[PDB]
């Protein structure tokens, strides 16, 4: 109680009532944790924090599906430039559309 009163984590004081244990690691193997939890139905998860971000079980289940960080960082730029790419594609497809229709006419003949 005394630590949770004055720390980075303060909102877990209601969580920490009664008997409780903590899963601690250096790697965010959330999938493995939830996987071994599904084995025993009665056992509940109250949540906590992963990667210094406070969240419960309902958030942890959807988080369990996550690829490598650098490619998501690149996908951020990809999504930002998605609008520009869409404009370029909408501008460039119509000449390509005519060329592909001519090719399809060739194939039909």
């Amino acid at each position: 109680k005394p630590f949770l009163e004055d720390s980075k984590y303060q909102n877990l004081l209601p969580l920490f009532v009664g008997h409780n244990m903590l899963l601690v690691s250096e790697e965010p193997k959330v999938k493995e944790m939830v996987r071994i939890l599904r084995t025993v139905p009665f056992l509940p998860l109250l949540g906590g924090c992963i990667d210094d971000t406070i969240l419960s079980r309902q958030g942890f289940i959807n988080y369990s599906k996550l690829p490598s960080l650098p490619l998501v960082q690149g996908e951020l730029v990809g999504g930002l430039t998605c609008l520009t790419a869409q404009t370029h594609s909408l501008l460039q497809h119509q000449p390509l559309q005519l060329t592909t229709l001519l090719d399809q006419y060739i194939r039909e003949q």
Partner: peptide, 30 residues
């Protein structure tokens, strides 16, 4: 605002925060 400030903020966010950022762009757009 500042170009440098915004760029470093994106890199500072963790993967879960980054994933939250990416999905929020998707539903706001399209």
């Amino acid at each position: 605002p500042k170009i440098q400030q915004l760029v470093q903020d994106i890199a500072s966010l963790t993967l879960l925060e980054i994933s939250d950022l990416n999905e929020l762009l998707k539903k706001t757009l399209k």
